[PDB]
């Protein structure tokens, strides 16, 4: 075999398999070729910065990834040296992990990778009934299902989660089972082991806490069993708790608002508590407001520690947590200034108050139309308002500088006032004759008319047109993102749960088949879905 | 959504104002509302400290409601 | 005609430079009109910052659409 | 705007190419590293016995059919 | 602006003796589904006068497909 680090471990058998030459594969196996030889050179790894082809480093995984079923069957079922179907590479990946890796959610790729996946699963069952390949974890601790969920390989999940195998002695491999079928109507059962809950890598957890770089993190939840499961979890357990939380937050903001509104106007905090009812309630509301701010502060820190965003995931995603945390930061700064005998504690407080009210929109999730509306607002702010505001600020600043240069020894005669006065045009309040302290009236009026045409006429209507184009395209994206926000809310609720409640675990310990490879019966927590079809009678 | 934004910024601004002509949720609410109809004064008072905070709040309100939310409403009505 | 229908950006940069030079000539010509040219150049300069939005996929498309709008829709509407 | 999306993408790429060409043509430093892609041998078999080095540019591609 | 002809030329590959040298696209290695092609690039990047990039980029704006021609695979990747 090769000894260089670039092609390390490549041997003749890899070549014969790779070239799709059955005869040489047979001859090499006959001559005692090692079917476990690991091709672990740099060329046979992921290695994004260099060319290569990762296939799990083993001959069996190679034949599998290359859509050579005959070679797979031979490698497992040859006379001279059968292959170890459970074999793992340096990463710990089995064949199935490799099949997940090579998937890219394209049609032909998904078709053949799914077919090969099914075939290898059947062969694994028939050769080794006690062996459970899918349960095997790599060095990352991921089962092939968990790997597929994390990597965004939607097609593989679309196969696995509703996998149904119609033959004797392979029924127990199915994850979808049909209990009864009367007429066009039949009741299916989806397994959902390690979807709802498990030790570490529940599929819902893996999707929801994805790193924002997974391609299809929005699309994956559309696969029927997950979507129905989330809807059931919502309706049964989480809707009420979420509404209660929203109510509590409304109470919090009302208390904060009342406490801030009735602040005293004297100088130099802290202020002596007067022995009267109004002030006792005031200081009470102040204390509760500060307490809630601290609560959100520590929730934000807990989020940061639990997820550990890497300084880009900290900003490109998870905006809600950042906004709530920033509000709490402003509250704490308000406290520090208050007890430091600085009147600037007002300045912080209002900012927190303002953000608090806007953060109320966080609870629009859980309501179908309103959460979508909130998501579209988020996307609009991130794309269209950012681009527009940059360009508009360029225009505003350029013309402000020109005009304030033209103005000399007037009331305005300064960048701040001129910028404000030009900005008044955008809100339909520009005076257009706001000063005469200049020479060259024609130049001044030309500048203002140019600014007005470029900003008020052209740019704003352009912004409207672009927003109209944007909403035309982000409808289904908005639907997926709202469903995802609902999902993460559900998972947080069930994970916190504050009561040691087990009722969150749904779907009932039902028996699917009753016939394992041994005589034992299998209870698999299946979730029931009824469906009607007027074809295939 | 607009009423949440309006109320929130009205509360912030009226808190910031002290012993002024407005100094009251109703007048401030109307005054911020006037921006939506293209009549926002934007300098309707000086009875505060921290001018920068005041103007920053008004600018944020204008951008969020007048610039973003209304044009978003137009776009959504176009889709509908 | 190719002098105008394309190379919009080069024309604008050139005009900025022209206004700067005219401002200089009027400055040393002992004329106070140099202010009038100068500010135009200044205004033009800041606007031409949008030239550099190109090389960004998101902003450059926006700037391109500004150019197309000015040529077609704004001109028709203003007439 | 509904009718000039794709036109806009092509214009974006186009004038970015303009920027590239002006940069390499001006270059202000007599730099030869701008001439990229390496002097590779394509065939090595011209009509005569000589070998041809033609400054090729590498592009790696992946296809799931025509094995 | 004859974009079709460029689409033919810039990725021209001829598999026979005494005609491979005419090819501008050559296949170096192909392991499984992956393979590395080599595009010739003579008179694209640079030449005496009429480098293809110079001709396209400095087109007269009346060339039909001046927006489209740079979508041709080797040119777009080279520019990137
Ligand atoms: C089309 C021509 C060359 C033009 C050149 C000048 C005089 C200009 O006035 C116009 C006429 C005009 C006047 C008032 C309102 C609209 C248009 O529009 C532009 C031109 C109009 C603009 C347009 O700004 C832009 O094009 C941004 C831009 C987009 C794409 C680009 O590739 C670009 O390269 C710099 C710049 C800005 C001005 O130069 C400017 O800032 C001043 C003070 C007047 C504008 O003449
Ligand atoms: C002075 C006053 C200033 C107020 C400034 C702020 C006003 C807007 C406040 C509106 C409240 C909206 C909200 O509450 O949240 C919005 C955040 O709005 C912004 O964009 C802030 C722009 C900065 C979405 O936050 P979200 O947590 O859902 O992020 C999503 C992920 O969770 C999800 O899983 C997906 O990964 C998705 O890709 C992510 O987006």
User: DSSP for A115-136?
Assistant: HHHHHHHHHHHHH-TT--GGG-
Nearest CA among A451, D14, A457 for reference residue C64: D14
β-pair partners for A532: A185
3-state secondary structure of A208: helix
Position in ligand 1 atom list of the atom nearest CA C16: 39
Strands (E), A250-300: none
Cβ under 8 Å to D: C residues 46-65: 54-55, 57, 60-61, 64-65
Give the count of alpha carbons within 13 A of A340, CB side only: 11
User: Which CATH number goes with the domain that contains A92?
Assistant: 1.25.40.20
Joined tokens for residue A44: 């046979």
DSSP H or E stretch at residue A498: none
DSSP H or E stretch at residue E2: none
β-pair partners for D59: E37
Q: Give the distance (Å) from ligand 2 centre to CA of residue A79.
A: 62
Angle at C43 between CA C38 and CA C48, to 5 degrees: 125
Which among C36, C46, C65 has the least Cβ separation from residue A398?
A: C46
The whole-angstrom separation of Cα A423 and Cα B66 is: 13
Tell me how far the alpha carbon of residue A273 is from its chain's centroid. 48
The whole-angstrom separation of Cα A461 and Cα A452 is: 12
Domain span at residue A131? 1-225
β-pair partners for A527: A190
Joined tokens for residue A101: 């890796």
| Ligand 2 contacts CB of residue A207 (under 6 A) | no
Cross-chain Cβ contact A357/B4 below 8 Å: yes
Annotated resolution, angstroms: 3.7
The whole-angstrom separation of Cα A390 and Cα C52 is: 13
Find out whether C41 and C20 touch, Cβ atoms under 8 Å.
yes
Find out whether A398 and A392 touch, Cβ atoms under 8 Å.
no
| Residue A155 Cα distances to A112, A413, A518, C55, D39, angstroms | 11, 65, 32, 35, 42
The whole-angstrom separation of Cα A374 and Cα A319 is: 12
Cross-chain Cβ contact A53/E36 below 8 Å: no
The whole-angstrom separation of Cα A286 and Cα E23 is: 80
CA of A66 to nearest chain E CA: how many angstroms apart?
Answer: 7
| Environment class of B4 (CB within 10 Å of its CB; exposed 0-12, middle 13-18, buried 19+) | middle
The whole-angstrom separation of Cα C53 and Cα C51 is: 5
Find out whether A203 and A149 touch, Cβ atoms under 8 Å.
yes
The whole-angstrom separation of Cα A201 and Cα A146 is: 6
Angle at A276 between CA A272 and CA A282, to 5 degrees: 70
The whole-angstrom separation of Cα A108 and Cα A110 is: 5
Joined tokens for residue A358: 């806007």
Ligand 1 mutation pick, C6, C42, C47, C78, max ligand atoms within 8 A of CB: C47
| Ligand 2 contacts CB of residue A358 (under 6 A) | yes
A256, A259, A263, A268 alpha-carbon torsion, rounded to 10°: -70
Joined tokens for residue C38: 């100068």
| Ligand 1 contacts CB of residue C18 (under 6 A) | no
Q: A527-532 and D57-62 as β-strands: parallel, antiparallel, unpaired?
A: unpaired
Residues in contact with C42: Cβ distance below 8 Å, sequence separation at least 6, in sequence order: A398, A401, A402, A405
Please tell me what DSSP assigns to residue A273. P
| Environment class of A266 (CB within 10 Å of its CB; exposed 0-12, middle 13-18, buried 19+) | exposed
DSSP H or E stretch at residue E25: strand E25-30
Please tell me what DSSP assigns to residue A52. -
Helix ranges (H only) for A77-197 are 95-102, 107-127, 144-151, 154-160
Joined tokens for residue C65: 């659409």
Q: E34-39 and D57-62 as β-strands: parallel, antiparallel, unpaired?
A: antiparallel
Joined tokens for residue D36: 């990229």
The whole-angstrom separation of Cα A149 and Cα A220 is: 8
Cα Rg of chain E (Å, integer): 14
E18: left (phi over 0), alpha (psi -120 to 50) or beta: left
Axis-axis angle for helices A239-261, A345-359 (nearest 10)? 150
The whole-angstrom separation of Cα A189 and Cα A430 is: 66
Q: E34-39 and A176-181 as β-strands: parallel, antiparallel, unpaired?
A: unpaired
The whole-angstrom separation of Cα A105 and Cα A108 is: 9
Find out whether A165 and A171 touch, Cβ atoms under 8 Å.
yes
The whole-angstrom separation of Cα A338 and Cα A266 is: 13
Exposed e or buried b per residue across A382-408, where buried means at least 16 C-beta atoms within 10 angstroms of its C-beta? eebbebbbebbebbbebbbbbbbbbbe
Nearest CA among E80, A89, A483 for reference residue D16: E80
DSSP H or E stretch at residue B1: none
HEC assignment per residue over A443-489: HHHHHHHHHHHHHHHHHHHHHHHHHHHHHHHCHHHHHHHHHHHHHHH
Find out whether A55 and A62 touch, Cβ atoms under 8 Å.
yes
Q: Give the distance (Å) from ligand 2 centre to CA of residue A328.
A: 16
The whole-angstrom separation of Cα A458 and Cα A426 is: 11
Which among A388, A398, A443 has the least Cβ separation from residue C47?
A: A398
3-state secondary structure of D58: strand
Q: Give the distance (Å) from ligand 2 centre to CA of residue A106.
A: 32
Provide, as residue numbers in chain C, all residues whose Cβ is less than 8 Å from the Cβ of E61: 2, 5-6
| Environment class of C10 (CB within 10 Å of its CB; exposed 0-12, middle 13-18, buried 19+) | exposed
The whole-angstrom separation of Cα A254 and Cα A417 is: 36
| Elucidation method | cryo-EM
Exposed e or buried b per residue across A70-105, where buried means at least 16 C-beta atoms within 10 angstroms of its C-beta? ebbebbbeeeeeebebebbbebebbbbbbbbbbbeb
Which among D1, D60, D65 has the least Cβ separation from residue A108?
A: D65
| Environment class of A444 (CB within 10 Å of its CB; exposed 0-12, middle 13-18, buried 19+) | buried
β-pair partners for A385: none
E11 touches chain D (CB under 8 A): no
The whole-angstrom separation of Cα A43 and Cα A60 is: 18
End-to-end CA distance of chain B: 18
Please tell me what DSSP assigns to residue E39. E
β-pair partners for A190: A176, A527
**What is the sign, positive or negative, of the torsion defined by CA atoms of E64, E65, E67, E69?**
negative
Residues in contact with A508: Cβ distance below 8 Å, sequence separation at least 6, in sequence order: A525, A526
3-state secondary structure of A314: helix
The whole-angstrom separation of Cα E73 and Cα A386 is: 32
The whole-angstrom separation of Cα A377 and Cα A202 is: 31
3-state secondary structure of A186: strand
The whole-angstrom separation of Cα A382 and Cα A374 is: 12
Find out whether A359 and A324 touch, Cβ atoms under 8 Å.
yes
Evaluate whether chains B and E are touching (3 or more beta carbon pairs less than 8 Å apart).
Answer: no
What number of residues does chain C have? 79
Helix ranges (H only) for C1-79 are 2-5, 8-28, 34-47, 57-69, 75-78
| Residue A271 Cα distances to A267, A268, A346, angstroms | 9, 7, 13
DSSP H or E stretch at residue A92: none
**At which residue do the structure tokens 């150049």 appear?**
C41
Residues in contact with B65: Cβ distance below 8 Å, sequence separation at least 6, in sequence order: B2, B5, B6, B35, B36
3-state secondary structure of B60: helix
Give the count of alpha carbons within 13 A of A29, CB side only: 26
Exposed e or buried b per residue across A116-148, where buried means at least 16 C-beta atoms within 10 angstroms of its C-beta? bbeebbebbbeeeeeeebbebbbeeebbbbbbb
End-to-end CA distance of chain E: 21
Find out whether A180 and A186 touch, Cβ atoms under 8 Å.
yes
| Environment class of A220 (CB within 10 Å of its CB; exposed 0-12, middle 13-18, buried 19+) | buried
Joined tokens for residue D4: 């000039």
Give the count of alpha carbons within 13 A of C76, CB side only: 5
Cβ under 8 Å to B: A residues 247-266: 257, 260-261, 263, 265
β-pair partners for E36: D60, E29
The CB density around residue A356, as the number of other CB atoms within 10 Å, is 28
DSSP H or E stretch at residue E28: strand E25-30
What are residue A504's phi and psi, to 5 degrees? -60, -25
Cross-chain Cβ contact D8/C64 below 8 Å: yes
Exposed e or buried b per residue across C38-58, where buried means at least 16 C-beta atoms within 10 angstroms of its C-beta? bbbbbbbbbbbebbebbeeee
Composition of chain D by helix, strand, coil, percent to 5: 35, 10, 55
The whole-angstrom separation of Cα A452 and Cα A22 is: 76
Residues in contact with A226: Cβ distance below 8 Å, sequence separation at least 6, in sequence order: A161, A195, A203, A204, A207, A220
Nearest CA among A227, A189, A197 for reference residue A502: A197
The whole-angstrom separation of Cα A451 and Cα A432 is: 11
Is B41 annotated to bind a ligand? Reply is: yes
Joined tokens for residue C50: 């949008």
The whole-angstrom separation of Cα A364 and Cα A362 is: 6
Find out whether C39 and A431 touch, Cβ atoms under 8 Å.
no
**At which residue do the structure tokens 């001129």 appear?**
A418
The whole-angstrom separation of Cα A221 and Cα A229 is: 10
Find out whether D7 and C55 touch, Cβ atoms under 8 Å.
no
């Amino acid at each position: 075999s090769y000894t260089d680090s670039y092609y390390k471990g490549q041997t003749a058998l890899h070549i014969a398999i790779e070239r799709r030459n059955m005869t040489l594969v047979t001859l090499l196996v006959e001559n005692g070729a090692d079917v476990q030889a690991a091709a672990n050179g740099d060329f046979f790894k992921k290695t994004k910065g260099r060319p290569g082809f990762y296939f799990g480093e083993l001959p069996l995984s190679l034949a599998a990834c290359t859509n050579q079923l005959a070679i797979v069957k031979f490698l497992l079922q040859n006379s001279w040296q059968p292959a170890d179907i459970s074999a793992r590479d340096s990463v710990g990946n089995t064949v199935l992990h490799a099949l997940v890796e090579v998937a890219d959610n394209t049609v032909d790729n998904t078709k053949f990778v799914t077919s090969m996946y099914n075939e290898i699963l059947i062969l694994g069952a028939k050769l080794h009934p006690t062996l459970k390949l899918e349960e095997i974890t790599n060095r990352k601790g991921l089962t092939p299902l968990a790997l597929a969920a994390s990597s965004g390989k939607i097609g593989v999940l679309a196969y696995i989660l509703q996998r149904e195998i119609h033959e004797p002695e392979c029924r127990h491999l199915s994850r979808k089972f049909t209990e009864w079928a009367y007429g066009p109507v039949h009741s299916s059962l989806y397994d959902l082991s390690c979807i709802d809950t498990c030790e570490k890598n529940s599929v819902l957890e893996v999707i929801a806490y994805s790193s924002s770089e997974t391609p299809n993190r929005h699309d994956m939840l559309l696969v029927e069993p997950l979507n129905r499961l989330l809807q059931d979890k919502w309706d049964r357990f989480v809707k009420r708790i979420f509404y209660f939380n929203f109510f509590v937050y409304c109470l919090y903001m009302i208390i904060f608002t009342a406490a801030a509104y009735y602040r005293p106007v004297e100088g130099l905090p802290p202020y002596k508590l007067k022995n009267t009812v109004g002030d006792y309630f005031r200081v009470t509301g102040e204390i509760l407001s500060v307490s809630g701010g601290v609560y959100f502060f520590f929730r934000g820190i807990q989020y940061f520690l639990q997820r550990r965003p890497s300084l880009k995931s900290l900003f490109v995603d998870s905006y809600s947590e950042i906004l709530f945390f920033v509000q709490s930061l402003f509250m704490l700064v308000s406290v520090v200034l208050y007890f430091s005998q600085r009147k600037e504690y007002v300045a912080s407080m209002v900012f927190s108050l303002a953000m608090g009210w806007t953060n109320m929109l966080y609870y629009t999730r859980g309501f179908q139309q309103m959460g979508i509306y909130a998501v579209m607002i988020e996307k609009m702010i991130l794309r269209d308002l950012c681009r527009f505001m940059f360009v508009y600020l360029v225009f505003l600043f350029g013309f402000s500088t020109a005009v304030v240069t033209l103005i000399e020894d007037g009331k305005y005669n300064s960048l701040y006032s001129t910028c404000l006065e030009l900005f008044k045009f955008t809100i339909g309040m520009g005076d257009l004759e706001f000063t005469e302290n200049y020479d060259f009236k024609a130049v001044f009026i030309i500048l203002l008319l140019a600014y007005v045409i470029l900003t008020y006429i052209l740019l704003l209507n352009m912004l409207i047109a672009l927003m109209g184009e944007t909403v035309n395209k982000i409808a289904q994206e908005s639907k997926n993102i709202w469903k995802l926000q609902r999902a993460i809310t559900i998972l947080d609720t069930e994970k916190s749960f504050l009561k040691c409640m087990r009722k969150a675990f749904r779907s009932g310990k039902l028996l699917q088949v009753g016939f394992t490879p041994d005589g034992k019966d299998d209870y698999r927590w299946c979730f029931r879905v009824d469906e009607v079809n007027w074809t295939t009678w």
